[PDB]
Amino acid sequence: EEKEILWNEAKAFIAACYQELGKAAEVKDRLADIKSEIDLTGSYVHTKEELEHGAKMAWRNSNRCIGRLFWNSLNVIDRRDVRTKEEVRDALFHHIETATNNGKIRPTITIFPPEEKGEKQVEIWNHQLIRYAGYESDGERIGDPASCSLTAACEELGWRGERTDFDLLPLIFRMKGDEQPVWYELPRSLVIEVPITHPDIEAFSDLELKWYGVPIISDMKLEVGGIHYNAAPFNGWYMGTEIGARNLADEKRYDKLKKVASVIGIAADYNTDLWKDQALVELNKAVLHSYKKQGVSIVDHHTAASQFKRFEEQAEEAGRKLTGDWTWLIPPISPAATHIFHRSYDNSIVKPNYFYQDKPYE
Amino acid sequence: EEKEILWNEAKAFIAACYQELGKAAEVKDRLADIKSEIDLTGSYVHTKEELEHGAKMAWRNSNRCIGRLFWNSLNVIDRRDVRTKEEVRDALFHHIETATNNGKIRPTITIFPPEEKGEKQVEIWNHQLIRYAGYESDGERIGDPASCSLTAACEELGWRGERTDFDLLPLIFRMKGDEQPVWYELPRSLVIEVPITHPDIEAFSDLELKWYGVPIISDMKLEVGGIHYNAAPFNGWYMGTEIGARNLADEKRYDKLKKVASVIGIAADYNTDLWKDQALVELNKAVLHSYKKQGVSIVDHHTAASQFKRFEEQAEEAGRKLTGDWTWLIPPISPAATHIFHRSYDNSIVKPNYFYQDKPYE
Ligand code: HEM
Ligand code: HEM
Ligand SMILES: Nc1ccc2ccccc2n1
Ligand SMILES: Nc1ccc2ccccc2n1
Ligand SMILES: [Cl-]
Ligand SMILES: [Cl-]
């Protein structure tokens, strides 16, 4: 059952991949080499060209992603050569540095050795390479509640957080063979953070809010033609709403709306005053303004939706079927102001793609 | 095939309906009477109690409705006795008057004779009993574009609109037997309108915006136990966002965001300023404030979502399965500020319910 599946998926992938690359005639021979490799070894090794394009296709097929217009410019880093935890760590450090690019963020993926027999070579525990810790002890709520379980896991391994609201979690991953993961503190010089100020409300800085520059999702599995790259951290730049409308706004996250209303000088007493809505807008304006002032890449939800419209148009032109998840594609503020809201999307799964995996903690 | 379906649906309805009313033992005999009636006549007649509760159940099963908490207090008007177009007209006039109730809106449904053999006794052309006309001629865009097709249809029948942005469409319905519908102008004394002002921005009134008090949907089919009430107009009170975020905001509707930005004194030049988002909030604040000042019932989306949460809780307590459409239940502004956004809903269809019908115009 195992080698069969790998062969079928590989057939579908190589055909489509080589077609797109204008390498249609090189298929049969490449498919031949692959079949012999599967027979003998139980798996196959992607060329750099297949891997790079497979990672790009996977982003293109990510139904929940509004930023897919730039799928073909993804910066792919091939690190299937790593064997040591020092190599993994430095690769992760490197990813952060080059993706950050002094603020002009490069969408980047670093690809580690794939699963062998379903056995993981490298297992990254971080949800994102850069993420704030979260604590709850005796009524006291500190940091990012979404990070509570991973934080406790890290502290079970000898890490200790300073217990600010913005403790940088350590990188934490487990190598094949080891019973426990290792953790490495993040060098502050690698991590860009953005203090949140408002363009015309001076008191906004009293909230002492900040967020990190680059969202680098590191717990999802990249699947390319039957090969499972369980460890392949990827990043884009933020859409402002992810920070202003969710990370800082959600009651189960930083829950800052009541404090925002206070500093912008409005009452938070009546639903009919729409104070949460007003606070959301000013906070989201602050986030966009702050990243722009510091020279860190970010996109507003209107511009992002426009770009996505072009992705839809580009897809139709290329003869490609379009897939998407309406419930994730709409922005969390003023979604009806975008074209996305006013149409429907086929939520079918197409491979290559990125998939959820079970957390090793929890 | 026809009498079979009617019998099956009637079995399911009467059982559930009489169970809910604590009339469980009266089922068998009532089911008996119904089966004899179907055999002989080809259809059955609901009691006033069955009809009233069936209409209430239908609202309870409306997946796309956020205001379902008050399903059991629906004011049901039984007008299956109407035979003349003067009777229909006066029933519609009456519905408007009693539902409006001087501003303290009563959720109300008026039920007309149902389809006989699939033959309609009464066919209402209006989307809502109160709706603004729409025109497009030689570049000129006037009124509500969503009403363009019905407006042209009305004008094809001898009606003529004044061509303001807020022409009240006439009531228009067709009786069984007649080739054409009849139309009656709406008495202004029956229709409450609300001028849109802002609580602290005096210049907002310069937009000369207004909307009508009561949304009375009149083109949907009520289905109760196999009986098809194709003509059964129903109403609640508005949720503010329906007006401020959609009717007045959509580009394909009144498209007022750019003008709103102007009167509230903000630039509409850069997406990163989130001017559409800010305009949406102030406009939606204006709508809520305006209805409240005039003493016309309205609900904000936060309060409505809270009420819906109680509907969910009430449903669980009653042992009833909950159904809903996430894509319609979330409000079009700050949806992530509501609990609705953060959960999922089974979108299965349960009868009794309200259904779409083909427009006789178009
Ligand atoms: C270029 C900048 C990018 C922007 C602005 C962007 C925007 C977004 C946003 C807003 C989401 C929704 C996240 C949420 O609601 O929690 C999302 C989801 C996603 N994006 Fe992108 N994205 C970008 C680049 C990328 C890249 C480079 C990849 C991978 C190659 C990617 C793959 C995904 C995936 C897999 C999801 C779904 C994650 C999940 O299901 O939890 N995106 N994107
Ligand atoms: C009591 C006040 C009510 C409020 C605030 C309310 C709120 C809403 C809202 C906001 C929508 C979405 C409309 C849209 O997005 O276009 C909706 C849909 C709906 N409501 Fe209600 N509603 C109320 C009462 C009722 C009543 C009395 C009925 C019928 C007995 C009803 C049945 C429906 C139906 C059938 C839909 C879906 C219409 C469609 O699919 O186009 N609602 N409701
Ligand atoms: N802004 C952004 C970029 C990439 C993502 C990948 C997965 C989840 C969220 C993301 N956001
Ligand atoms: N506010 C409100 C009440 C009832 C409705 C019925 C159908 C569509 C929209 C509605 N809105
Ligand atoms: Cl994030
Ligand atoms: Cl409406």
Side-chain angles (χ1 to χ4, degrees), chain A residues 95-96 99-101 103 105-106 128-131 190-193 211-217 234-238 291 296-297:
Chain A
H95 186 129
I96 291 180
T100 297
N101 194 26
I105 296 170
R106 291 183 280 241
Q128 287 175 25
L129 295 188
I130 308 174
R131 195 71 155 171
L190 277 179
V191 186
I192 288 192
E193 294 183 295
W211 208 253
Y212 51 88
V214 197
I216 315 173
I217 280 68
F234 53 84
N235 76 276
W237 50 77
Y238 265 115
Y291 275 66
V296 178
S297 299

PDB file of all heavy atoms in Angstrom, chain A residues 95-96 99-101 103 105-106 128-131 190-193 211-217 234-238 291 296-297:
ATOM      1  N   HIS A  95      17.062  31.481   8.097  1.00  0.00           N
ATOM      2  CA  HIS A  95      15.751  31.758   7.518  1.00  0.00           C
ATOM      3  C   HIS A  95      15.220  33.085   8.041  1.00  0.00           C
ATOM      4  O   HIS A  95      14.758  33.924   7.270  1.00  0.00           O
ATOM      5  CB  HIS A  95      14.766  30.632   7.835  1.00  0.00           C
ATOM      6  CG  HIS A  95      13.433  30.777   7.156  1.00  0.00           C
ATOM      7  ND1 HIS A  95      12.864  29.763   6.426  1.00  0.00           N
ATOM      8  CD2 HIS A  95      12.564  31.815   7.118  1.00  0.00           C
ATOM      9  CE1 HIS A  95      11.695  30.172   5.951  1.00  0.00           C
ATOM     10  NE2 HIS A  95      11.492  31.408   6.353  1.00  0.00           N
ATOM     11  N   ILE A  96      15.288  33.264   9.357  1.00  0.00           N
ATOM     12  CA  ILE A  96      14.845  34.501   9.987  1.00  0.00           C
ATOM     13  C   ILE A  96      15.566  35.712   9.396  1.00  0.00           C
ATOM     14  O   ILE A  96      14.933  36.708   9.049  1.00  0.00           O
ATOM     15  CB  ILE A  96      15.068  34.467  11.512  1.00  0.00           C
ATOM     16  CG1 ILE A  96      14.129  33.453  12.172  1.00  0.00           C
ATOM     17  CG2 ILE A  96      14.865  35.843  12.120  1.00  0.00           C
ATOM     18  CD1 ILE A  96      14.288  33.356  13.684  1.00  0.00           C
ATOM     19  N   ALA A  99      14.747  36.184   5.374  1.00  0.00           N
ATOM     20  CA  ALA A  99      13.341  36.502   5.158  1.00  0.00           C
ATOM     21  C   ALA A  99      13.047  37.909   5.653  1.00  0.00           C
ATOM     22  O   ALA A  99      12.290  38.649   5.031  1.00  0.00           O
ATOM     23  CB  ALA A  99      12.449  35.495   5.848  1.00  0.00           C
ATOM     24  N   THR A 100      13.645  38.265   6.786  1.00  0.00           N
ATOM     25  CA  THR A 100      13.477  39.598   7.352  1.00  0.00           C
ATOM     26  C   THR A 100      14.051  40.656   6.411  1.00  0.00           C
ATOM     27  O   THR A 100      13.392  41.655   6.116  1.00  0.00           O
ATOM     28  CB  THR A 100      14.140  39.713   8.739  1.00  0.00           C
ATOM     29  OG1 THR A 100      13.494  38.819   9.656  1.00  0.00           O
ATOM     30  CG2 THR A 100      14.025  41.125   9.264  1.00  0.00           C
ATOM     31  N   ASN A 101      15.278  40.422   5.950  1.00  0.00           N
ATOM     32  CA  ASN A 101      15.935  41.287   4.973  1.00  0.00           C
ATOM     33  C   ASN A 101      15.874  42.769   5.345  1.00  0.00           C
ATOM     34  O   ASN A 101      15.499  43.610   4.524  1.00  0.00           O
ATOM     35  CB  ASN A 101      15.335  41.056   3.581  1.00  0.00           C
ATOM     36  CG  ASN A 101      16.177  41.655   2.475  1.00  0.00           C
ATOM     37  OD1 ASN A 101      17.391  41.820   2.618  1.00  0.00           O
ATOM     38  ND2 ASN A 101      15.534  41.988   1.363  1.00  0.00           N
ATOM     39  N   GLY A 103      13.795  44.393   6.969  1.00  0.00           N
ATOM     40  CA  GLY A 103      12.469  44.981   6.884  1.00  0.00           C
ATOM     41  C   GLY A 103      11.754  44.742   5.566  1.00  0.00           C
ATOM     42  O   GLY A 103      10.523  44.666   5.530  1.00  0.00           O
ATOM     43  N   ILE A 105      10.692  42.317   3.668  1.00  0.00           N
ATOM     44  CA  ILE A 105      10.482  40.879   3.828  1.00  0.00           C
ATOM     45  C   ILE A 105      10.432  40.077   2.527  1.00  0.00           C
ATOM     46  O   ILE A 105       9.680  40.408   1.611  1.00  0.00           O
ATOM     47  CB  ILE A 105       9.204  40.604   4.649  1.00  0.00           C
ATOM     48  CG1 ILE A 105       9.374  41.146   6.069  1.00  0.00           C
ATOM     49  CG2 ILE A 105       8.892  39.115   4.678  1.00  0.00           C
ATOM     50  CD1 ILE A 105       8.104  41.144   6.889  1.00  0.00           C
ATOM     51  N   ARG A 106      11.241  39.019   2.469  1.00  0.00           N
ATOM     52  CA  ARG A 106      11.219  38.074   1.359  1.00  0.00           C
ATOM     53  C   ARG A 106      10.414  36.851   1.759  1.00  0.00           C
ATOM     54  O   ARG A 106      10.769  36.171   2.725  1.00  0.00           O
ATOM     55  CB  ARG A 106      12.636  37.624   0.994  1.00  0.00           C
ATOM     56  CG  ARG A 106      13.513  38.692   0.364  1.00  0.00           C
ATOM     57  CD  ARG A 106      14.874  38.121  -0.025  1.00  0.00           C
ATOM     58  NE  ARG A 106      15.781  38.032   1.114  1.00  0.00           N
ATOM     59  CZ  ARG A 106      16.948  38.667   1.194  1.00  0.00           C
ATOM     60  NH1 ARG A 106      17.362  39.431   0.191  1.00  0.00           N
ATOM     61  NH2 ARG A 106      17.705  38.533   2.274  1.00  0.00           N
ATOM     62  N   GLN A 128       5.212  29.258  15.255  1.00  0.00           N
ATOM     63  CA  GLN A 128       5.992  30.158  14.418  1.00  0.00           C
ATOM     64  C   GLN A 128       7.382  30.291  15.024  1.00  0.00           C
ATOM     65  O   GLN A 128       7.533  30.221  16.245  1.00  0.00           O
ATOM     66  CB  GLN A 128       5.316  31.527  14.305  1.00  0.00           C
ATOM     67  CG  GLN A 128       4.069  31.536  13.428  1.00  0.00           C
ATOM     68  CD  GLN A 128       3.352  32.870  13.443  1.00  0.00           C
ATOM     69  OE1 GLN A 128       3.955  33.912  13.700  1.00  0.00           O
ATOM     70  NE2 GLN A 128       2.052  32.844  13.171  1.00  0.00           N
ATOM     71  N   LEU A 129       8.392  30.471  14.174  1.00  0.00           N
ATOM     72  CA  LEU A 129       9.772  30.600  14.642  1.00  0.00           C
ATOM     73  C   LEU A 129       9.913  31.758  15.627  1.00  0.00           C
ATOM     74  O   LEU A 129      10.680  31.680  16.592  1.00  0.00           O
ATOM     75  CB  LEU A 129      10.730  30.778  13.463  1.00  0.00           C
ATOM     76  CG  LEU A 129      10.862  29.605  12.488  1.00  0.00           C
ATOM     77  CD1 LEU A 129      11.981  29.856  11.491  1.00  0.00           C
ATOM     78  CD2 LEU A 129      11.095  28.305  13.239  1.00  0.00           C
ATOM     79  N   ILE A 130       9.162  32.827  15.377  1.00  0.00           N
ATOM     80  CA  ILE A 130       9.088  33.954  16.297  1.00  0.00           C
ATOM     81  C   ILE A 130       7.670  34.056  16.855  1.00  0.00           C
ATOM     82  O   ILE A 130       6.719  34.312  16.113  1.00  0.00           O
ATOM     83  CB  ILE A 130       9.451  35.276  15.598  1.00  0.00           C
ATOM     84  CG1 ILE A 130      10.793  35.148  14.876  1.00  0.00           C
ATOM     85  CG2 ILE A 130       9.493  36.415  16.602  1.00  0.00           C
ATOM     86  CD1 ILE A 130      11.150  36.357  14.035  1.00  0.00           C
ATOM     87  N   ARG A 131       7.539  33.858  18.163  1.00  0.00           N
ATOM     88  CA  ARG A 131       6.235  33.855  18.818  1.00  0.00           C
ATOM     89  C   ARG A 131       6.425  34.227  20.282  1.00  0.00           C
ATOM     90  O   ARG A 131       7.443  33.885  20.885  1.00  0.00           O
ATOM     91  CB  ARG A 131       5.597  32.468  18.702  1.00  0.00           C
ATOM     92  CG  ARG A 131       4.107  32.412  19.024  1.00  0.00           C
ATOM     93  CD  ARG A 131       3.279  33.088  17.948  1.00  0.00           C
ATOM     94  NE  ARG A 131       1.918  32.559  17.915  1.00  0.00           N
ATOM     95  CZ  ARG A 131       0.927  33.081  17.201  1.00  0.00           C
ATOM     96  NH1 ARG A 131       1.137  34.162  16.462  1.00  0.00           N
ATOM     97  NH2 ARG A 131      -0.277  32.527  17.234  1.00  0.00           N
ATOM     98  N   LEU A 190      18.488  39.225  15.572  1.00  0.00           N
ATOM     99  CA  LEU A 190      17.822  38.590  14.437  1.00  0.00           C
ATOM    100  C   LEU A 190      16.354  38.993  14.329  1.00  0.00           C
ATOM    101  O   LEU A 190      15.766  38.945  13.245  1.00  0.00           O
ATOM    102  CB  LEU A 190      17.918  37.066  14.553  1.00  0.00           C
ATOM    103  CG  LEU A 190      19.189  36.380  14.056  1.00  0.00           C
ATOM    104  CD1 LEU A 190      19.104  34.878  14.272  1.00  0.00           C
ATOM    105  CD2 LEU A 190      19.401  36.686  12.591  1.00  0.00           C
ATOM    106  N   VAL A 191      15.767  39.395  15.453  1.00  0.00           N
ATOM    107  CA  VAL A 191      14.328  39.631  15.515  1.00  0.00           C
ATOM    108  C   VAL A 191      13.970  41.113  15.479  1.00  0.00           C
ATOM    109  O   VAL A 191      14.311  41.866  16.394  1.00  0.00           O
ATOM    110  CB  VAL A 191      13.719  38.990  16.778  1.00  0.00           C
ATOM    111  CG1 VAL A 191      12.203  39.122  16.770  1.00  0.00           C
ATOM    112  CG2 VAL A 191      14.123  37.529  16.877  1.00  0.00           C
ATOM    113  N   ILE A 192      13.280  41.523  14.416  1.00  0.00           N
ATOM    114  CA  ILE A 192      12.741  42.879  14.321  1.00  0.00           C
ATOM    115  C   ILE A 192      11.383  42.947  15.011  1.00  0.00           C
ATOM    116  O   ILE A 192      10.509  42.109  14.763  1.00  0.00           O
ATOM    117  CB  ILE A 192      12.575  43.333  12.852  1.00  0.00           C
ATOM    118  CG1 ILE A 192      13.939  43.593  12.213  1.00  0.00           C
ATOM    119  CG2 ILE A 192      11.715  44.587  12.761  1.00  0.00           C
ATOM    120  CD1 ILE A 192      13.861  44.314  10.873  1.00  0.00           C
ATOM    121  N   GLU A 193      11.211  43.935  15.883  1.00  0.00           N
ATOM    122  CA  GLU A 193       9.920  44.181  16.507  1.00  0.00           C
ATOM    123  C   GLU A 193       9.454  45.590  16.169  1.00  0.00           C
ATOM    124  O   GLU A 193      10.271  46.476  15.906  1.00  0.00           O
ATOM    125  CB  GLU A 193      10.002  43.975  18.022  1.00  0.00           C
ATOM    126  CG  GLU A 193      10.282  42.535  18.421  1.00  0.00           C
ATOM    127  CD  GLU A 193      10.292  42.329  19.920  1.00  0.00           C
ATOM    128  OE1 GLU A 193      11.182  42.891  20.592  1.00  0.00           O
ATOM    129  OE2 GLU A 193       9.412  41.599  20.426  1.00  0.00           O
ATOM    130  N   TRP A 211       4.591  44.207  18.095  1.00  0.00           N
ATOM    131  CA  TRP A 211       4.527  42.889  17.485  1.00  0.00           C
ATOM    132  C   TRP A 211       5.800  42.631  16.692  1.00  0.00           C
ATOM    133  O   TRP A 211       6.557  43.562  16.396  1.00  0.00           O
ATOM    134  CB  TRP A 211       3.285  42.743  16.602  1.00  0.00           C
ATOM    135  CG  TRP A 211       2.828  41.323  16.506  1.00  0.00           C
ATOM    136  CD1 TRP A 211       2.954  40.488  15.435  1.00  0.00           C
ATOM    137  CD2 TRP A 211       2.197  40.561  17.537  1.00  0.00           C
ATOM    138  NE1 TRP A 211       2.428  39.255  15.734  1.00  0.00           N
ATOM    139  CE2 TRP A 211       1.954  39.274  17.025  1.00  0.00           C
ATOM    140  CE3 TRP A 211       1.802  40.845  18.850  1.00  0.00           C
ATOM    141  CZ2 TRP A 211       1.340  38.271  17.774  1.00  0.00           C
ATOM    142  CZ3 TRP A 211       1.194  39.854  19.593  1.00  0.00           C
ATOM    143  CH2 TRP A 211       0.967  38.582  19.055  1.00  0.00           C
ATOM    144  N   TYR A 212       6.044  41.366  16.367  1.00  0.00           N
ATOM    145  CA  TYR A 212       7.245  40.988  15.633  1.00  0.00           C
ATOM    146  C   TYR A 212       7.027  41.143  14.132  1.00  0.00           C
ATOM    147  O   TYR A 212       5.902  41.034  13.646  1.00  0.00           O
ATOM    148  CB  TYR A 212       7.674  39.558  15.986  1.00  0.00           C
ATOM    149  CG  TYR A 212       6.572  38.525  15.885  1.00  0.00           C
ATOM    150  CD1 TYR A 212       6.313  37.873  14.688  1.00  0.00           C
ATOM    151  CD2 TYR A 212       5.805  38.190  16.993  1.00  0.00           C
ATOM    152  CE1 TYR A 212       5.315  36.924  14.594  1.00  0.00           C
ATOM    153  CE2 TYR A 212       4.802  37.243  16.909  1.00  0.00           C
ATOM    154  CZ  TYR A 212       4.563  36.614  15.707  1.00  0.00           C
ATOM    155  OH  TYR A 212       3.566  35.667  15.615  1.00  0.00           O
ATOM    156  N   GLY A 213       8.109  41.402  13.404  1.00  0.00           N
ATOM    157  CA  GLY A 213       8.016  41.722  11.990  1.00  0.00           C
ATOM    158  C   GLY A 213       7.533  40.609  11.079  1.00  0.00           C
ATOM    159  O   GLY A 213       6.702  40.845  10.197  1.00  0.00           O
ATOM    160  N   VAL A 214       8.046  39.398  11.285  1.00  0.00           N
ATOM    161  CA  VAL A 214       7.855  38.325  10.314  1.00  0.00           C
ATOM    162  C   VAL A 214       7.141  37.093  10.869  1.00  0.00           C
ATOM    163  O   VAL A 214       7.638  36.443  11.786  1.00  0.00           O
ATOM    164  CB  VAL A 214       9.204  37.877   9.734  1.00  0.00           C
ATOM    165  CG1 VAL A 214       8.988  37.085   8.458  1.00  0.00           C
ATOM    166  CG2 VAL A 214      10.088  39.079   9.460  1.00  0.00           C
ATOM    167  N   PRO A 215       5.977  36.757  10.290  1.00  0.00           N
ATOM    168  CA  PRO A 215       5.241  35.534  10.631  1.00  0.00           C
ATOM    169  C   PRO A 215       5.820  34.333   9.882  1.00  0.00           C
ATOM    170  O   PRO A 215       5.674  34.236   8.662  1.00  0.00           O
ATOM    171  CB  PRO A 215       3.821  35.834  10.142  1.00  0.00           C
ATOM    172  CG  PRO A 215       4.014  36.776   8.984  1.00  0.00           C
ATOM    173  CD  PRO A 215       5.274  37.568   9.276  1.00  0.00           C
ATOM    174  N   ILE A 216       6.476  33.432  10.606  1.00  0.00           N
ATOM    175  CA  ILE A 216       7.131  32.289   9.983  1.00  0.00           C
ATOM    176  C   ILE A 216       6.537  30.978  10.487  1.00  0.00           C
ATOM    177  O   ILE A 216       7.013  30.411  11.469  1.00  0.00           O
ATOM    178  CB  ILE A 216       8.647  32.292  10.259  1.00  0.00           C
ATOM    179  CG1 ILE A 216       9.233  33.690  10.045  1.00  0.00           C
ATOM    180  CG2 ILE A 216       9.355  31.265   9.383  1.00  0.00           C
ATOM    181  CD1 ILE A 216      10.689  33.821  10.461  1.00  0.00           C
ATOM    182  N   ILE A 217       5.505  30.495   9.801  1.00  0.00           N
ATOM    183  CA  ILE A 217       4.776  29.301  10.235  1.00  0.00           C
ATOM    184  C   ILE A 217       5.653  28.059  10.094  1.00  0.00           C
ATOM    185  O   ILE A 217       6.155  27.766   9.009  1.00  0.00           O
ATOM    186  CB  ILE A 217       3.444  29.133   9.463  1.00  0.00           C
ATOM    187  CG1 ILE A 217       2.365  30.041  10.060  1.00  0.00           C
ATOM    188  CG2 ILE A 217       2.970  27.688   9.504  1.00  0.00           C
ATOM    189  CD1 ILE A 217       2.603  31.532   9.861  1.00  0.00           C
ATOM    190  N   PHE A 234       7.771  28.353   6.613  1.00  0.00           N
ATOM    191  CA  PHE A 234       7.570  29.327   5.544  1.00  0.00           C
ATOM    192  C   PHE A 234       7.021  30.648   6.073  1.00  0.00           C
ATOM    193  O   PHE A 234       6.393  30.690   7.134  1.00  0.00           O
ATOM    194  CB  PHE A 234       6.645  28.764   4.460  1.00  0.00           C
ATOM    195  CG  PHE A 234       5.333  28.248   4.985  1.00  0.00           C
ATOM    196  CD1 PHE A 234       4.264  29.109   5.204  1.00  0.00           C
ATOM    197  CD2 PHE A 234       5.164  26.899   5.247  1.00  0.00           C
ATOM    198  CE1 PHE A 234       3.056  28.634   5.677  1.00  0.00           C
ATOM    199  CE2 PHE A 234       3.962  26.417   5.726  1.00  0.00           C
ATOM    200  CZ  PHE A 234       2.904  27.287   5.939  1.00  0.00           C
ATOM    201  N   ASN A 235       7.254  31.722   5.321  1.00  0.00           N
ATOM    202  CA  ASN A 235       6.829  33.051   5.744  1.00  0.00           C
ATOM    203  C   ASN A 235       6.417  33.944   4.583  1.00  0.00           C
ATOM    204  O   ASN A 235       6.887  33.780   3.456  1.00  0.00           O
ATOM    205  CB  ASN A 235       7.953  33.747   6.516  1.00  0.00           C
ATOM    206  CG  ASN A 235       9.051  34.264   5.603  1.00  0.00           C
ATOM    207  OD1 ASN A 235       9.960  33.524   5.228  1.00  0.00           O
ATOM    208  ND2 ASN A 235       8.971  35.540   5.239  1.00  0.00           N
ATOM    209  N   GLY A 236       5.532  34.891   4.874  1.00  0.00           N
ATOM    210  CA  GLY A 236       5.254  35.990   3.971  1.00  0.00           C
ATOM    211  C   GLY A 236       5.443  37.252   4.783  1.00  0.00           C
ATOM    212  O   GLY A 236       6.215  37.260   5.746  1.00  0.00           O
ATOM    213  N   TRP A 237       4.760  38.323   4.396  1.00  0.00           N
ATOM    214  CA  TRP A 237       4.670  39.502   5.248  1.00  0.00           C
ATOM    215  C   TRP A 237       3.265  39.538   5.830  1.00  0.00           C
ATOM    216  O   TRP A 237       2.364  38.871   5.321  1.00  0.00           O
ATOM    217  CB  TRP A 237       4.966  40.778   4.461  1.00  0.00           C
ATOM    218  CG  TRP A 237       4.184  40.876   3.200  1.00  0.00           C
ATOM    219  CD1 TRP A 237       2.870  41.219   3.074  1.00  0.00           C
ATOM    220  CD2 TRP A 237       4.667  40.625   1.878  1.00  0.00           C
ATOM    221  NE1 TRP A 237       2.504  41.196   1.749  1.00  0.00           N
ATOM    222  CE2 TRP A 237       3.589  40.836   0.994  1.00  0.00           C
ATOM    223  CE3 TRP A 237       5.904  40.244   1.353  1.00  0.00           C
ATOM    224  CZ2 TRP A 237       3.716  40.676  -0.384  1.00  0.00           C
ATOM    225  CZ3 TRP A 237       6.027  40.085  -0.011  1.00  0.00           C
ATOM    226  CH2 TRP A 237       4.940  40.300  -0.865  1.00  0.00           C
ATOM    227  N   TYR A 238       3.073  40.299   6.901  1.00  0.00           N
ATOM    228  CA  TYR A 238       1.773  40.341   7.561  1.00  0.00           C
ATOM    229  C   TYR A 238       0.727  41.098   6.759  1.00  0.00           C
ATOM    230  O   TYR A 238       1.046  42.051   6.041  1.00  0.00           O
ATOM    231  CB  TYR A 238       1.890  41.000   8.934  1.00  0.00           C
ATOM    232  CG  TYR A 238       2.080  40.038  10.081  1.00  0.00           C
ATOM    233  CD1 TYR A 238       3.252  40.037  10.823  1.00  0.00           C
ATOM    234  CD2 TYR A 238       1.074  39.154  10.444  1.00  0.00           C
ATOM    235  CE1 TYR A 238       3.424  39.169  11.883  1.00  0.00           C
ATOM    236  CE2 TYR A 238       1.237  38.281  11.499  1.00  0.00           C
ATOM    237  CZ  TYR A 238       2.413  38.295  12.215  1.00  0.00           C
ATOM    238  OH  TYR A 238       2.577  37.425  13.268  1.00  0.00           O
ATOM    239  N   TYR A 291       4.310  49.698  11.074  1.00  0.00           N
ATOM    240  CA  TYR A 291       5.169  48.890  10.219  1.00  0.00           C
ATOM    241  C   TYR A 291       5.739  49.727   9.076  1.00  0.00           C
ATOM    242  O   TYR A 291       6.909  49.586   8.717  1.00  0.00           O
ATOM    243  CB  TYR A 291       4.398  47.679   9.679  1.00  0.00           C
ATOM    244  CG  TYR A 291       4.384  46.502  10.631  1.00  0.00           C
ATOM    245  CD1 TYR A 291       3.730  46.584  11.853  1.00  0.00           C
ATOM    246  CD2 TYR A 291       5.022  45.313  10.306  1.00  0.00           C
ATOM    247  CE1 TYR A 291       3.714  45.518  12.729  1.00  0.00           C
ATOM    248  CE2 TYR A 291       5.013  44.236  11.177  1.00  0.00           C
ATOM    249  CZ  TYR A 291       4.357  44.348  12.388  1.00  0.00           C
ATOM    250  OH  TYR A 291       4.340  43.284  13.262  1.00  0.00           O
ATOM    251  N   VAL A 296       9.134  48.141   7.680  1.00  0.00           N
ATOM    252  CA  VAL A 296       8.883  46.707   7.674  1.00  0.00           C
ATOM    253  C   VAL A 296       7.675  46.426   6.793  1.00  0.00           C
ATOM    254  O   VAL A 296       6.625  47.059   6.946  1.00  0.00           O
ATOM    255  CB  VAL A 296       8.642  46.163   9.092  1.00  0.00           C
ATOM    256  CG1 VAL A 296       8.325  44.672   9.044  1.00  0.00           C
ATOM    257  CG2 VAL A 296       9.860  46.414   9.967  1.00  0.00           C
ATOM    258  N   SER A 297       7.829  45.481   5.868  1.00  0.00           N
ATOM    259  CA  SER A 297       6.774  45.155   4.914  1.00  0.00           C
ATOM    260  C   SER A 297       5.482  44.725   5.601  1.00  0.00           C
ATOM    261  O   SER A 297       5.502  43.976   6.581  1.00  0.00           O
ATOM    262  CB  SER A 297       7.237  44.065   3.943  1.00  0.00           C
ATOM    263  OG  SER A 297       8.354  44.494   3.186  1.00  0.00           O
TER     264      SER A 297
END
